[PDB]
Amino acid sequence: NGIFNTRLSRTFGYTVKATTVRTPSWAVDMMRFNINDFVPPGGGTNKISIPFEYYRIRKVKVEFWPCSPITQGDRGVGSTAVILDDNFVTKATALTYDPYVNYSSRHTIPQPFSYHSRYFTPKPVLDSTIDYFQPNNKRNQLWLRLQTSANVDHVGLGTAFENSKYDQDYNIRVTMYVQFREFNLKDPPL
């Protein structure tokens, strides 16, 4: 039974710079998830540090851990929308409106110091021209080959943060819940 369900994680910093504009503006950005970040390159005869041929990403969880104190003023309200098709709102430093507010997948992120997370099933980008994705069915989900450096992108999450007179720091943990298949482990002698 090759099937092995594990959990993989990483963390990166993301900063919303302090702006001098008064009228409300939002900073727009995007998150793509590629497993090359999560699995280190292996060594020896085994190419990847995880000895399986196939994977498929079952659920992705994106935590927003703020670095800001609860005593920081000039609070604001952002929005986090799930983006399945790799069609993102263009990145912007200050945008007069919150573009993701009317997406059906939007959750609100209070700012700066509030904790926010989204938990959903991501989709791989199979053809950038067509941009098609599967419904969520755990049985029918496509299996993907695990490749050394060439792994495909999974497109999850757009975010729009309202600007502030202060810096807004988050520590974004991304935890993928992956399912691996086909134990491939190689064992040359000596």
**Residue choice 4, 19, 59, 61 for contact with a copy of itself (CB under 8 A):** 4
Closer residue to a copy of itself, CB minimum distance, 19 or 72: 72
CA distance 111 to 70: 10
Q: How far is the CB of 163 from a copy of itself (least distance, A)?
A: 12
Is residue 20 within the footprint of a copy of itself (CB under 8 A)? no
Site string for a copy of itself, 104-123 (x = CB under 8 A): xx----x--x----------
Which residues in 158-187 contact a copy of itself (CB under 8 A)?
162, 169, 171, 173, 181-187
Binder of a copy of itself out of 60, 98, 157, 178 (CB under 8 A): 98
Q: Which residues are within 8 A (CB) of 143 and not within 5 positions of it... i.e. 6 or more apart?
A: 54, 55, 56, 181
The sign of the CA dihedral 15, 21, 23, 28 is negative
CB-based contacts of 63, cutoff 8 Å, min separation 6: 115, 116, 117, 172, 173, 174, 175
Total residues interacting with a copy of itself, rule: CB under 8 A = 91
Contact status: 140 vs a copy of itself (CB under 8 A):
yes
29 lies in the site for a copy of itself, by CB under 8 A: no
Q: Please, what is the Cα angle at 103 between 100 and 105, to 5 degrees? A: 110
Nearer to a copy of itself (CB atom), residue 68 or residue 93: 68
Of 30, 54, 61, 92, the one binding a copy of itself by CB under 8 A: 54
Q: How far is the CB of 169 from a copy of itself (least distance, A)?
A: 7
Residues in a beta bridge with 82 = 157
If one asks whether residue 49 binds a copy of itself (CB under 8 A), the answer comes out as yes
Distances (CA, A) of 131 to 18, 144, 155, 156: 35, 17, 11, 13
